[PDB]
Amino acid sequence: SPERLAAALFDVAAESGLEGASVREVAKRAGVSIGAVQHHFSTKDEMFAFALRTLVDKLLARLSEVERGGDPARALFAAMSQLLPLDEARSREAHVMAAFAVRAATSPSLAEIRRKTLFTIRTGLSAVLIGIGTPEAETRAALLLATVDGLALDAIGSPALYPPEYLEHALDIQIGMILQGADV
Amino acid sequence: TSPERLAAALFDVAAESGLEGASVREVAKRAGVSIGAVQHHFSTKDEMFAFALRTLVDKLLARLSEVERGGDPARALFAAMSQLLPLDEARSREAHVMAAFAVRAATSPSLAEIRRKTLFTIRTGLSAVLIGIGTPEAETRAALLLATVDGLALDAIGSPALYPPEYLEHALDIQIGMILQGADVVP
Ligand SMILES: CCCCCCCCCCCCO[C@@H]1O[C@H](CO)[C@@H](O[C@H]2O[C@H](CO)[C@@H](O)[C@H](O)[C@H]2O)[C@H](O)[C@H]1O
Ligand SMILES: CC[N+](C)(C)CCCS(=O)(=O)[O-]
Ligand SMILES: CC[N+](C)(C)CCCS(=O)(=O)[O-]
I want to staple A129 with a disulfide (CB 3.0 to 4.6 A). Which of A26, A33, A137, B47 is the partner? Predict the structure, then answer.
């Protein structure tokens, strides 16, 4: 049931933003007793945090498939492109992730989950860049991730300015910049 | 003037509780006016939100246009992009509300239009600066620079204590350095 609720929340949020994800609306979409929800989560914020944790765990599993050695540029691109709205699935994910990032302004649990998530991805990016002798690796890693997050935010609210082919070109350009001075 | 007072109340509510807290009734309550007074100016909550967003983007663009460009592009780019970073309380509030509207833009055509126009305007100015100095891939690097400030602002929302102004300014300086690599400039 809690997994079902997390999927149902993501589904509502992608459709109608997080303002649509009332305890009531999430129940309809999964099955389930409005009490069944209350059984698993004592607060709405608990329910949101669980959904975010689910989305993050799925993202990290995806990074682990695509970021598997060999050419650094291609690995960095495959990983960062998971965060960009390049198809309908990733457009929904980007929408929901951005929504959680704004909701973190008023929710310490969501802010902490995001902080740990960014720390994890950033450390992974840093390890890649250090391994190839990149100048200012850690700072550049932070910048790569921040820039990808910003591109995703910019794109969801203005898709005509950020078609997938443009997003892919912009990510290529950013990666090329980050790798300047690396070997290779 | 009256719609402007309502836009200011909306911003005050949104900076506190997000845009979820910015119902017509909550905005009316914060402004000290009747629901009827609000509905008089705004036919819909959409129109209320769009007007508030326009008010905000006007303020931001006015600040960007006040940047002294002079003869040093790195300095000008830093001064301009610093205005879009949460380096103090006022800009932290602006970041929170602007990010909220960006997210709402995913489902609201009126907000998307205002966001698109804003991004187009800013990218155009940044591209002019970069082309002016022979920056490789100037247009895309302009879009990347703007994305950097947007992404850094987004993260600083949830963890403001961890993104102090000096961290944000350092990150921005490093990105500008990368953006200017291969441009006709003299460091
Ligand atoms: C220093 C180096 C880097 C420099 C970076 C430069 C950034 C450039 C910003 C300055 C330009 C501001 O110019 C401003 O553009 C916006 C469009 O976005 C216009 O605004 C127009 O669209 C908006 C948004 O839909 C409406 O709310 C507004 O009523 C309408 O007039 C303003 O009428 C114009 O005065
Ligand atoms: C005609 C007067 N001006 C200020 C130009 C436009 C009025 C519409 S407004 O206030 O919503 O920009
Ligand atoms: C409501 C408080 N928020 C912004 C969610 C968390 C603060 C995290 S902090 O202290 O590291 O900036």
Answer: A137
